[PDB]
A = this chain, B = another copy of it.
Amino acid sequence: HHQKLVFFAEDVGSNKGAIIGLMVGGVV
């Protein structure tokens, strides 16, 4: 009577990069 269950989940809502807000520059 063998029985095995496997439940796996990965990479949900993650950020290992860059979320930047505002960038501005130049003579004014």
- Using a CB–CB distance below 8 Å, which chain A residues touch chain B? 1-28
Q: Tell me, in angstroms, the Cα distance from A18 to B3 when the chains sit together.
A: 33
Cα separation A16 to B1 with both chains bound (whole Å):
44
CB distance from A18 to the nearest CB of B (A): 5
Q: Which residues of B contact A25 (CB under 8 A)?
A: 24-26
Determine the chain B residues whose CB is within 8 A of the CB of A18 once the complex forms: 17-20
Query: Can you identify 27 A-B contacts, CB atoms within 8 angstroms?
Result: A2-B2, A3-B3, A5-B5, A6-B7, A7-B22, A7-B24, A8-B9, A9-B9, A9-B12, A11-B12, A11-B14, A12-B13, A12-B21, A13-B13, A13-B15, A15-B17, A16-B17, A17-B18, A18-B18, A18-B19, A18-B20, A19-B19, A19-B20, A20-B21, A20-B23, A22-B24, A26-B26
